[PDB]
Amino acid sequence: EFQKVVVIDAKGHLLGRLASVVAKQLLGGQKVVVVRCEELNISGHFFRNKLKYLAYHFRAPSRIFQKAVRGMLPHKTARGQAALEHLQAVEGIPPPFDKQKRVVVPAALRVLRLKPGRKYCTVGRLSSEVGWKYNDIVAKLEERRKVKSAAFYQAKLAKQKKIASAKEASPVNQKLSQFGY
Amino acid sequence: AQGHRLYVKAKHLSFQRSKHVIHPGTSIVKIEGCDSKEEAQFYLGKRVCYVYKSSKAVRGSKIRVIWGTIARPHGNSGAVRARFVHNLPAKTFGSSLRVMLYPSNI
Amino acid sequence: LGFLPRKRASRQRGKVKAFPKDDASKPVHLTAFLGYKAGMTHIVRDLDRPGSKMHKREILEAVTVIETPPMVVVGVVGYVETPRGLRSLTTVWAEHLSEEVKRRFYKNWFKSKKKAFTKYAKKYAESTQSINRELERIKKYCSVVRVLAHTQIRKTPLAQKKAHLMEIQVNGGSVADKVEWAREHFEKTVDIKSTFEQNEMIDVIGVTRGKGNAGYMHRTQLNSKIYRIGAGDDAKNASTDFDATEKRITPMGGFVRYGVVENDFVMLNGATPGPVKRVLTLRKSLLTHTSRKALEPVSLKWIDTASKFGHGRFQ
RNA sequence: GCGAAACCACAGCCUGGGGAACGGGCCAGGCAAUCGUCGCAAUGGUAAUUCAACUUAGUACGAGAGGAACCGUUGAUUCAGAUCAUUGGUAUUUGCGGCCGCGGAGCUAUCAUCUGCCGGAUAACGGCUGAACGCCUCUAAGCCAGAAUCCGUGCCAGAAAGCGACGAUUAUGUAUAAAAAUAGAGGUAGGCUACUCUCCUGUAUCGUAGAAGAUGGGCGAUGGUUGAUGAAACGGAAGUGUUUUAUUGACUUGUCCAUGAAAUUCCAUGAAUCCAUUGCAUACGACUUUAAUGUGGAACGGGGUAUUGAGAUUAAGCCUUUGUUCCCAAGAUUUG
RNA sequence: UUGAGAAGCUCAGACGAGUAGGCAGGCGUGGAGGUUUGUGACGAAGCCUUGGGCGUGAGCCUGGGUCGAACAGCCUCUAGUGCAGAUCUUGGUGGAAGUAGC
RNA sequence: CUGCCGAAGUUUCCGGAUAGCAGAAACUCAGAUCAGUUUUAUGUGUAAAAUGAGAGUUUCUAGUGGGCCAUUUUUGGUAAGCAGAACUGGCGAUGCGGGAUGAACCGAACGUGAGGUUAAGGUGCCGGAAUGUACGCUCAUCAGAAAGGUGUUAGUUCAU
């Protein structure tokens, strides 16, 4: 299934694997928005990736994730230039996308790709000492949004419980249960 | 506006090509819900179409359609090879192609 | 390379690129002020620095005097911090607008119809609910509060009729406390005497004076301690209590390129960028230093009011 | 105003590799470009720098003498930032007094007076604790300490192709929101302690019934679906959308009927700029205030003021003007 | 069954790089004898044109616009016969350049 | 302008005459001879079965009458490399797929086209094609595509 707008949560996702699936999707004429890019993960411990950046200048993981894709797409080709603008990488979950579903990519999930006991690095933690100086405010927004979202979930859960009780109380439900519904 | 859509959405990926040589006679189409070569057998023979609009009002309408036909599968991920009456423009990469259900074999 | 490239300052009035860190525990108070440098004069002050080679001795040093008339708060600006930086959520101005501020807001004071903010003033008078809602949102959502005030250009003997209005961040207290303080101080004159006790080291920001076909570059001198912050109304502002002799701080025959200063003025040791009759910004230092020089009190002994123009001989 | 010759395959960002130059073309690369007013900072440059001594203490060490870390002071710097107050000169007040004797203003300065960074990360380096190696073990876990370095930090500039606030204003169902573990989470229930249940995805869930969804007859809900407006709260971030509804307008295939919908009789569909003013500038623009009927400004008349040595010039980048008149409630232009 | 331009028509199979070089068939220009009882003031030749065609190609036929006095297809004869270069000859014209400058 | 054939690129004696390659003609044969062929066997050569192809002459006439690379073979070497002769192919007269690009490497040698399938190489993205399956190994704090290691991985052997 593909949509005109797709929101992908970057928490617990490998950078390269996430970059690959979005690179193909972007060439497919699809708009993809990436949120919480600061919580991306890269195989290899913290010092190695720190040395990698020291050899390498954009401090935003949203820019870094965009930069990784930029060299992973035909940038010279005008088609690649057009597809670049269809990708929107932002840190955290902004209000224009907080009230929308956030899907995940199985091919990039750390739990499905990383062996237990393997060291890994977090981009937001990595970027904190390279020029980024907004971790507190970015974090502060995260708990504020999730607290509001959790309250929304509780209201939705209560509504789901009420309708579920109403659904079971409905005699119509088991009239034609032979269809598996 | 629930209803209509007697076809299946599909995306026009690219042409049949080597690493550097492209043959634009046939184009790769990725149909939704098709994810294996054995599955693409069902869509072999269907009539695919490209639908686009233009400023000129021809016959009182504003729609131009380039018909086509699915021919063979392409790889293990459900892609297909479709030949059109007019070869698709190279700009329509990553667009929508409407795979209607005829000629039906079911 | 620190100052390179050498380019003329883009702003005639010095703008502070940074402000001191605000403390919630500390009371709400201002952190910056604007003044016009009238000139520099030589004064004799006792050096009460323990351990110095000339301890308990009087030294003749240059004192820079800048007129600091009370500033009327035109309005407040609510800036909400964002991951991309500090975002100005909104700004609220007072119902009554000063003529100099309106004159400053337009490039053609005489040709203008003085219609600036006329609807906003009319809307505020008609209904204050929007202002209260805006103030409540600033006090509840905005993280940075800046108060916009205009200097007394008309009071100062300056040919320019436009006030050197600037926005100063508010440090101290909570957002609601700052909002309440701004509302209380809205459309009210704030003097530098309450802001500065003239017993601390601050920073002065100003644009240097060009020297023809090198100059006109903004600078921010630091480690500057105010020697005396006098009031123009008081006749003893320029006279110390050591020998009385009440007199005006202005030099004989008028100050060089400044004239006569009648409002509150502040005199500090050392030189500052820019020529006479130039707008300068004085703000508290972001970093606090516990040096003996910055902690020892300043007590002027003799103030020379001789004619700065020409070769004066009588104070 | 009058006016060549030379030259010319075609061009012109580099980075590397490209085997034979290859860079001037090839591949990987980067690069590659309404009027406003006040603010924000992506980004870079970058800053303070090099050494000391006294105090400390004239003492830990040391038989004593000589001389402790740290504290502040005294500084010497270098560099940058300033300014002409202080100091000297320079000096178109080239002003003065007798070509000289000098020179105010202003400029200038290791010629002058001066002002002048922050904590971390850690390097070297030494650790503590702690496995392998029941201990031990800078270390494989961890906890550290510690550099004129680095990063931060501060300063400077500002994305000319960044941003905010703010004033005036000529396609085919385009369907879907928890957080968080994942090596256990969530819910469920009891009083954080004892429970239980689900997961093992979305092929899920919601919605999808009618001449694009007709005409009416009902029945049945007498509910539901919504449209229309009347705003209430929430939503700073990018709140611009989430509900709450108030009433009204319809619709209702919720259960049903009766007609109706076609020969297309096989696919193609008003401000501001220039301008004047302006010196606060000055390769030239820019910059700079004022200026469109009033402290209006601009000019002089001056005065004051110092200069020279009382007098004259007397603000010119010395001050000021209850003095005088001039001009003008501009001249055009730009721009929705 | 008409399919004898016997230099014709028809059938089958394999094959197809190319320098130096060898062989063969053609296209085009000026003029010459024959010819088309050829074309032309109701518009020759030429010229331009994103008109239409033909040939693998050299080349050709045609529409439109200009144009105004000649021209062509076919069989042979014949030669001062085909150009992108030669720091080629002649004429024209640009950038350089409103530059050096006067 | 198109079509066909198309070398030699060097032996050998000695600027050449030969030759050779390519043609062009004339001949005689396929029941006749052959082969950068392979066997059989007699003593690596020679002679006599298979596998294929028709084979042999005479005459006369253009062009070439260099090399580079690679393989190998050796001899010495000579700091060490290497050099020196050869040996045989490929390029040279030859485009295409692959090797990031790249004249020597891996494939394959060319009329215009349609479909089909492949070689070499590839299937994360750029990039056409499985983010295939099974099994291990690799932790790098410069991976990856002589040795040392309080470096691990699997361990083996010997001691208790």
Curated annotation (Swiss-Prot), chain A:
This is Large ribosomal subunit protein uL13B. It comes from Schizosaccharomyces pombe (strain 972 / ATCC 24843). GO terms for biological process: cytoplasmic translation; negative regulation of translation. The keyword Ribonucleoprotein applies. One of its GO terms (molecular function) is mRNA binding. Its main location: cytoplasm. There are 3 genes for uL13 in S.pombe. It is found in: Cytoplasm.
Curated annotation (Swiss-Prot), chain B:
GO terms for biological process: cytoplasmic translation; ribosomal large subunit biogenesis. Pfam families: Ribosomal_L35Ae. The gene is rpl35a. It is found in: Cytoplasm. Its main location: cytoplasm. The modification Phosphoserine is found at S96. Component of the ribosome, a large ribonucleoprotein complex responsible for the synthesis of proteins in the cell. The small ribosomal subunit (SSU) binds messenger RNAs (mRNAs) and translates the encoded message by selecting cognate aminoacyl-transfer RNA (tRNA) molecules. The large subunit (LSU) contains the ribosomal catalytic site termed the peptidyl transferase center (PTC), which catalyzes the formation of peptide bonds, thereby polymerizing the amino acids delivered by tRNAs into a polypeptide chain. It comes from Schizosaccharomyces pombe (strain 972 / ATCC 24843). One of its GO terms (molecular function) is structural constituent of ribosome. One of its GO terms (cellular component) is preribosome. Keywords: Cytoplasm, Phosphoprotein, Ribonucleoprotein, Ribosomal protein. The keyword Manganese does not apply. Belongs to the eukaryotic ribosomal protein eL33 family. This is Large ribosomal subunit protein eL33B. SUPFAM superfamilies: Translation proteins. Component of the large ribosomal subunit (LSU). Mature yeast ribosomes consist of a small (40S) and a large (60S) subunit. The 40S small subunit contains 1 molecule of ribosomal RNA (18S rRNA) and at least 33 different proteins. The large 60S subunit contains 3 rRNA molecules (25S, 5.8S and 5S rRNA) and at least 46 different proteins. There are 2 genes for eL33 in S.pombe.
From Swiss-Prot, chain C:
Residues 1-21 are annotated as: Disordered. Keywords: Cytoplasm, Phosphoprotein, Ribonucleoprotein, Ribosomal protein. The modification Phosphoserine is found at S52, S127, S130, S194, S239, S299. GO terms for cellular component: cytosol; cytosolic large ribosomal subunit; preribosome. Residues 5-18 have a biased composition (Basic residues). One of its GO terms (molecular function) is RNA binding. GO terms for biological process: cytoplasmic translation; translation. It is found in: Cytoplasm. Its main location: cytoplasm. The keyword Lipid biosynthesis does not apply. It comes from the Eukaryota. InterPro entries: L3_arc_euk, Ribosomal_L3_dom_3_arc_sf, Ribosomal_uL3, Ribosomal_uL3_CS, Transl_B-barrel_sf. SUPFAM superfamilies: Translation proteins. The keyword Glycoprotein does not apply. PANTHER family: 60S RIBOSOMAL PROTEIN L3-RELATED, LARGE RIBOSOMAL SUBUNIT PROTEIN UL3. Component of the large ribosomal subunit (LSU). Mature yeast ribosomes consist of a small (40S) and a large (60S) subunit. The 40S small subunit contains 1 molecule of ribosomal RNA (18S rRNA) and at least 33 different proteins. The large 60S subunit contains 3 rRNA molecules (25S, 5.8S and 5S rRNA) and at least 46 different proteins. uL3 forms together with ES39L one of the contact sites for the signal recognition particle that targets ribosomes to the endoplasmic reticulum membrane. Component of the ribosome, a large ribonucleoprotein complex responsible for the synthesis of proteins in the cell. The small ribosomal subunit (SSU) binds messenger RNAs (mRNAs) and translates the encoded message by selecting cognate aminoacyl-transfer RNA (tRNA) molecules. The large subunit (LSU) contains the ribosomal catalytic site termed the peptidyl transferase center (PTC), which catalyzes the formation of peptide bonds, thereby polymerizing the amino acids delivered by tRNAs into a polypeptide chain. There are 2 genes for uL3 in S.pombe. Belongs to the universal ribosomal protein uL3 family. This is Large ribosomal subunit protein uL3A. It comes from Schizosaccharomyces pombe (strain 972 / ATCC 24843) (Fission yeast). The gene is rpl301.
